[PDB]
Amino acid sequence: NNRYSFIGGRTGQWQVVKIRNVLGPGLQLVEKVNILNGADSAWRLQGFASNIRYAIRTELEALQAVQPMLNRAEAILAVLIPIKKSAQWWEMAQDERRDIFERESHHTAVGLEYLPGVARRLLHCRDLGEEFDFLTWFEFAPEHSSAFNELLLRMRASKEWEYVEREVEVWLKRL
Amino acid sequence: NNRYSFIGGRTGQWQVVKIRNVLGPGLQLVEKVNILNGASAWRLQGFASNIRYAIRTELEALQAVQPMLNRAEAILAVLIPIKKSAQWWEMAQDERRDIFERESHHTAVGLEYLPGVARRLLHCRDLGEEFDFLTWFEFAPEHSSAFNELLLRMRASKEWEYVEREVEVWLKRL
Ligand code: HEM
Ligand code: HEM
């Protein structure tokens, strides 16, 4: 099953360290997040794992060579980052979006510099009618915390991020 | 709302003319199809979504000539659920784009059939449906022959070597 739900509330596998309401309406602070594979709580986010939309074969080969698995023993820290991009983004053609995502913003090339420390999972949810477009998930050991914070500053300055209209960070610790 | 459901059964806006079970398991013949914007013998559903392959110049060409849905003359339609293979879905984005257009010329061929044929593309693989896409075409009867020719051109393409299941539900507006 390709559907995942993230329930902000009082139960779950993950303790909420902090929530940063980066842009637009935030998410209510809660004690924990419960993650269910499938479709007292304060909010629910859901999304699906999907096929590749932008990465080219050589980029997949580079990612496959180095990206770590989810659920490593040392990956006790995580961050759930729901993101919404603008109508102007979604109206663009496929070449126009690819050009912004990689040619201008270097999303893949830049992210690669933070592997293997950072593991990730990408879910999509615009097509479900959700309030966000994407749920991004990152997990890593404390030793990569500083590197992940650097990555966030670099991505938020990119051309791609000029099309982001809502964004929240839910910082988590594995219970 | 971006979700559409197609219910094969006794009620609906469309009378079934015939069903051709082109490849793989078919769909049960029924009297009518009921189309509902939102989430009898069978139900198919899918969502309208962003562009996945077409480039700007292709969209400009399509926008220059493609007709709208619900033309008064467009009393015939064809619902074509399609599933593609796992090997297709594993390919990277450039690999699929190259097959879809550089090799199979999906948009360039399809454009030869506008403005006669109007269309709508729905996606459903991500919903866990048994098909990956619901495709919808509609047109006046004078384009029936051209549309049957288009179908045979597409099925000869490299892109169609990855199609694993395909049904045609032919319909007439009530
Ligand atoms: C950690 C290293 C990272 C790597 C290796 C990476 C890589 C990728 C790749 C290859 C894709 C495209 C997948 C496809 O073709 O469909 C993607 C999508 C995306 N990534 Fe990252 N990423 C990283 C970090 C980040 C971070 C920190 C964020 C958010 C703050 C982010 C947000 C996104 C978004 C929103 C998308 C969807 C883009 C779209 O479809 O418009 N990524 N990522
Ligand atoms: C009538 C003229 C046609 C035109 C102008 C046309 C055009 C297109 C375009 C531009 C796309 C890509 C949309 C995107 O980038 O996301 C597409 C997708 C698709 N079309 Fe057509 N089409 C036509 C006929 C047909 C026919 C007759 C069929 C079925 C027999 C069909 C099956 C599909 C499928 C399954 C997809 C999804 C491709 C994928 O994402 O892998 N098309 N069509």
From TrEMBL, chain A:
InterPro entries: ChdC/CLD (IPR010644), Dimeric_a/b-barrel (IPR011008). Its cofactor is Fe-coproporphyrin III. Its EC number is 1.3.98.5. It is an enzyme of class 1 (oxidoreductase). It catalyses: Fe-coproporphyrin III + 2 H2O2 + 2 H(+) = heme b + 2 CO2 + 4 H2O. It holds the Pfam family Chlor_dismutase. Pathway: Porphyrin-containing compound metabolism. The keyword Heme applies. Signal peptide: none annotated. GO terms for molecular function: heme binding; metal ion binding; oxidoreductase activity. It comes from the Bacteria. Heme b binds at residues 53-55, 85, 107. Keywords: Heme, Iron, Metal-binding. The keyword Transmembrane does not apply. This is hydrogen peroxide-dependent heme synthase.
From TrEMBL, chain B:
Its EC number is 1.3.98.5. InterPro entries: ChdC/CLD, Dimeric_a/b-barrel. Pathway: Porphyrin-containing compound metabolism. Keywords: Heme, Iron, Metal-binding. It is an enzyme of class 1 (oxidoreductase). It catalyses: Fe-coproporphyrin III + 2 H2O2 + 2 H(+) = heme b + 2 CO2 + 4 H2O. It comes from the Bacteria. Heme b binds at residues 52-54, 84, 106. This is hydrogen peroxide-dependent heme synthase. It comes from Cyanothece sp. (strain PCC 7425 / ATCC 29141). The lineage of its organism: Bacteria, Bacillati, Cyanobacteriota, Cyanophyceae, Gomontiellales.
